[PDB]
Amino acid sequence: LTGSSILAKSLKSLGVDVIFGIVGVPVVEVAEACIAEGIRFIGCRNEQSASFAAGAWGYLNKRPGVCLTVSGPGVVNAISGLYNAQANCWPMILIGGSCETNQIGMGAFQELDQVDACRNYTKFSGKCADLETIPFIVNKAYQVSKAGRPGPTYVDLPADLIQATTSKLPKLPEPFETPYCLPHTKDLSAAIEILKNSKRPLLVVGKGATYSRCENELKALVEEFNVPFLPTPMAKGILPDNHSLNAGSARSLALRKADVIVLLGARLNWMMQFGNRLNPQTKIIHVDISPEEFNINKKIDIGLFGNIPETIELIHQGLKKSGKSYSWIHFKNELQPNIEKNQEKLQKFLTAPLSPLMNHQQALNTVEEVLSKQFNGDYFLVSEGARTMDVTRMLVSSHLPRRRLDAGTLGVMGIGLGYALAGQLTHPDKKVVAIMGDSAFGFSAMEIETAARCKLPLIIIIINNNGIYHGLDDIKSVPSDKLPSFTLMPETRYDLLANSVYGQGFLVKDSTQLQSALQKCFNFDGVSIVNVMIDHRP
Amino acid sequence: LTGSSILAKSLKSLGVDVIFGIVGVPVVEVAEACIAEGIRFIGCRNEQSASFAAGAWGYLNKRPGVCLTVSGPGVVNAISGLYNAQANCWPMILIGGSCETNQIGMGAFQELDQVDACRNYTKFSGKCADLETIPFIVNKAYQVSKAGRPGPTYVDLPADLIQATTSKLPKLPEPFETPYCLPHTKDLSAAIEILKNSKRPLLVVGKGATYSRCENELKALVEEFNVPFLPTPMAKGILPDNHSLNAGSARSLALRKADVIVLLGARLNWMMQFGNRLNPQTKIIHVDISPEEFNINKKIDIGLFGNIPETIELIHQGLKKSGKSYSWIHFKNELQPNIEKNQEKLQKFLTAPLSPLMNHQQALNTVEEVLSKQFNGDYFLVSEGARTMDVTRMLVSSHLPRRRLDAGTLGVMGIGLGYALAGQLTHPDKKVVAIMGDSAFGFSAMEIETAARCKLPLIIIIINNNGIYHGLDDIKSVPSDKLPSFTLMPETRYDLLANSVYGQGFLVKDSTQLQSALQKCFNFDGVSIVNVMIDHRP
């Protein structure tokens, strides 16, 4: 028994079956011990992507993802994923090797107080003091990351413990089911009365709801009482985007005109403009597991402190108790004229003359037609970029829960390939399509070798406008000192990157090439990159 | 006048001429304001590389490099380069946009306390409170980064200031020459007397000595009195690797046998094994600008608190005053049998059977022959990896000061392309060769597009053994759960990445093809990638 194998056995007793990371001094022994215990190891090319993958994996699987890094710069690179998981409220454990304990203060190799470096990004950050305490620290990180509001944790394994030996196996952690809570009956009763008296109720469904896996309870409630709902971006698909009660296509109007809003796992942070655009007379019912979230940015009527799935059901039962036959389809019907105006605005983009290239909307509309016909809603989507991501949110539909990851609460670029790895590993029998802007893609592009090596046959679609929001179409005549900050190199051949990893690449300039390229990606055993050149202009 | 242009005018008045970064919300207007003031902007593909480039550029240029990032995850990604510059003692300024000030606490877009996030990685971290204080904060970061022991600083620009306008130009910073200091005369005289009584003195020359640009003084001293010297890795070349007084080829014996060691800008940290292998009877003279560095890890005899170049010259004048002539060539000559024994050990690697692929030594010995014939030492070298870096240090020689950058005090992977950009921008008339392991390369490989776009014709040599220290030559038959953590995909075709950016790539498997490929890189107007497949075994 070594520090490595006790760490590995502790993770194994808690059900960990895949770890992302990059090895070296001193943690290669830790990774090989985990593999020796039957835990798969996904070696990445940058710890940014490894720690993004771990966080997304935790969100998808409702249990902590695990990331493993070397000391010093390994952990510092992974702070990007700690910050990401903390913002997204996603469970994960970052395990970092650290320098020899008795060399701290001497300028040890990759010396860093890594517990302190991670403390403000995590719900728990701690160091294994000795071999006997390894299970305790691992278990504490595991339990804490998944409890209450989920988030990341940090576990430090100093070099002198990794290679330390013992003959006595410390008591290993045993699984513990996360206890949850329910709203107080008084609050739940008041919220039920608010809904009963409402004329225009609106369920706002966030990624806390999809994480908690409330899709069945939400569907039963929405469909029995015709309750309009509106998903946040990663909640798209919890019910299909084309569901008859989905108000997503009239988002701004539905929010302004609703007289009751039920927030289901969604915060009134920047994504909801802090609640500033809500009618002050709207009554707000907030369902969250973090009680510190209630009545901060915006006055709310009722805070329902409880688990989303059971809370939906309790509200649904409350409405059934009266025996009355509530229906709010009228509110959804009232949003129909605004939905048709928004559709008419989209059509103007779709019929714009070719430049001779397509614009964002024309390219992504073709993608949606192709993907819809091939998969009928059953695949996995990763979405990242600026204009590429917003247009993908409008045009590329979701039909199942937790089949969509995007830049999230941070609006972080660089999650594309890590999230796609996590998605493919969670759904080995499904196709994973990652739709990325050309700028976004360059943050994590080298993980295509990780995907190829780990037999993850990703489909990568790059919407390429030669820069950030827009670009130049010729830089050879621009004096280098005056090269604008937003442009990338015109017609960068991201498609040819696929050949470095024995994949397949396609350069696409028109809808015919786009359709034909995508048809060749559906059954390819490897990485496909579709590099779609679009109009560079703003 | 905006926050953006007051920032840009402040940097320009302090002589800033190039900035690395990535733009977005809310920092696009800042980069464009810098460009309008005549400051060149290098848009990168990940903030890791941009912040590594700024720190390298500061070291090479003896004034702070500048890195610009967006709020939240932009700054967090750049903490890797802060940590790196702090560890290397390199001057730089990280300029981060941040969220609207009156939205802190509300879950603003990319909300992060960025002053605090950067506080422990920097000599100064501060926020611009209003338009009037921007020059003060910029000037403070600039002066602090380069004073004393150099290091990184952080300047926060909130989004409400970036967009703020005024008609009053604040007083702009004026350049100020960094004050140096000299050792106390009593300590200097004691150090001179120690050297006069020495029989086997050794000058240990670190990258503080190259940063302070002491090559002229060092040469004069070494050659007049025949004083053996030993460079640390990035000090290689301060005098040529084949200089007749260079003890680098008998490094452990020279350190073991010296009766006096003069530490010139080098720490007794992990790179010197904390001084643990030095003879306890060896007298130690330590020249540093950081007095907190003296007499911590190892008992020393004299701390010379002073600027390295002037201190070398004062020691030299002190020896020259005595009239009695000094020559320590005998010490160097005593090292020759060990130099020879080390060359014969190297020769066993160079003549080892081919697999049919070369080993690290055979590949890099060929690279050195080709580079030496072409440039006669006059080029720029970046070196990154584990075995690849160690063998490059042994075999690829340096002949001029500050023409070599490697993984440094952190042993950090991922600095390769960022260091190459800074080196090429500092020496536009020289060739930049980056010798990277295959694992190392994957951390920063997408910056080849930055190099192509900004007209930086890098020559990239990848020493490819299919993984980290070693790899497998076949993963097709390995069950995915048992894939080892150290391996990468066999024969990943990094050479083909060059085609994505209209460069040129070469797959190379023997010394003949390596020489032929390298000869085609010397005058190519673009990025060249030579992918050298070597034996995968450990």
Place this chain on the structure above:
Amino acid sequence: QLTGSSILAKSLKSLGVDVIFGIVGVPVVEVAEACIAEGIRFIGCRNEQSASFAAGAWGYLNKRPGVCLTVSGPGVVNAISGLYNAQANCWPMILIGGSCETNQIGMGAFQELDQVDACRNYTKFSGKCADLETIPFIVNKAYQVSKAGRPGPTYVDLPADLIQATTSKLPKLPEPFETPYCLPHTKDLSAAIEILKNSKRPLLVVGKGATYSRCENELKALVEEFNVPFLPTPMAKGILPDNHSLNAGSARSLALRKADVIVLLGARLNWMMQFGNRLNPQTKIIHVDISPEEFNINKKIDIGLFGNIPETIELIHQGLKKSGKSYSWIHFKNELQPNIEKNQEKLQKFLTAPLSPLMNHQQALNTVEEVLSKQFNGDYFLVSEGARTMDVTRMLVSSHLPRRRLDAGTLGVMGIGLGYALAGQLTHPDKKVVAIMGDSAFGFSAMEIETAARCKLPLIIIIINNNGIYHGLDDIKSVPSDKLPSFTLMPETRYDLLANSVYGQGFLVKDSTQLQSALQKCFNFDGVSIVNVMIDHRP
């Protein structure tokens, strides 16, 4: 046969530590007792605030780190006040904190706190002893770092499992190492000399970095050979006497504004100098400091002299001697005489103010100065703390010797009064320590009178009592409790009677005659004396 306690103690003793301030508990009492067994005196205080304040002041006074010892958790948190103080003042000290058992971290251990992190932003070095063999390295690093360069506080963490661990092998103990200093570059030095050579109105601004570095003899030689006007900051008062013929302190504002050259000697252009904002932009500034990050930040300077203050003064002096010109800048001091007289007339207006029937601040402190002047002729030790009390003490109570004055300093912190007095009395057992404090200031640390009585430190405490913070009420009996003003304390609180709690002597004083009589009884008393001086309560 050695323990963590004794390896720590022997490590401190080999580095010359001879006194430690602190408060013991679990398990650090074994550490203090091992220190006492090695010949190190332990000063047990009543609050860690005062202990850490005392350690920092002791460091300043003695030009070597003071040492503070506390228990885990709230012991260390209480001492962060003194770390912040020593950091702001640039004073060398080591805080030594016990911490919880290492293998209980994360479990909710008794007084569990990441104390290394807690102290990190307040210290130059914060570290933990990982095992018995590394105690000397950590202690030595804290000791060397605190005194090198710009001095400052450090933190050493001693976990409970280490305090109690035993070994039969003695680790190598630290050996003393003389702090290396630097000298300014010759180019900068020659440029500074040439600036001074061409000056008509030069001014040496002498700060507490100058007094810490002990440059009084070099400064005196330069000032007196060439008649160079100078101006001390509050704790530099006395480096040359307040009544030295070249002292411009009585015309501070005019001298600063009219100088054509300012030499800053261990003084910063921080809030205490209004950030340089009142200086004439045409004035040339020469800044002598050991922290190069200080140059050209708040204010444009001409020359940064990166070097040790005493040698740098001497090198400037020698540079002026080299020409053979008989430089004399007494004329600039003489130009300040109208302003000095105007300020003295302003003060005399306060001294002749009618009694109310109580004295005002100026009258009480002028009487104090008359008594102290007749009793000591300048040779005593002064601690000064308060708001108005402190400002009037600075104007009226004179200093005549270097490092004989401590006040609220860079933090303007209330609560240093008795800890500083303890350090001053321990540093000068052959001198009398007078602490002049406002009534509000005194209440922060007053219980340390028992520490002084217990440790045979015969402090003389003078409280200038106006019933509150800057001002007070003279009656609160008829004020409804909800409406009691925030600035007032209880009228005529009998701080003098506190002296009886520790077998000292106290005096209630309401006029200058009683003040004189009471003070005269304080100079030869074996114990603590407190003079409670009731003054006018109005603003």
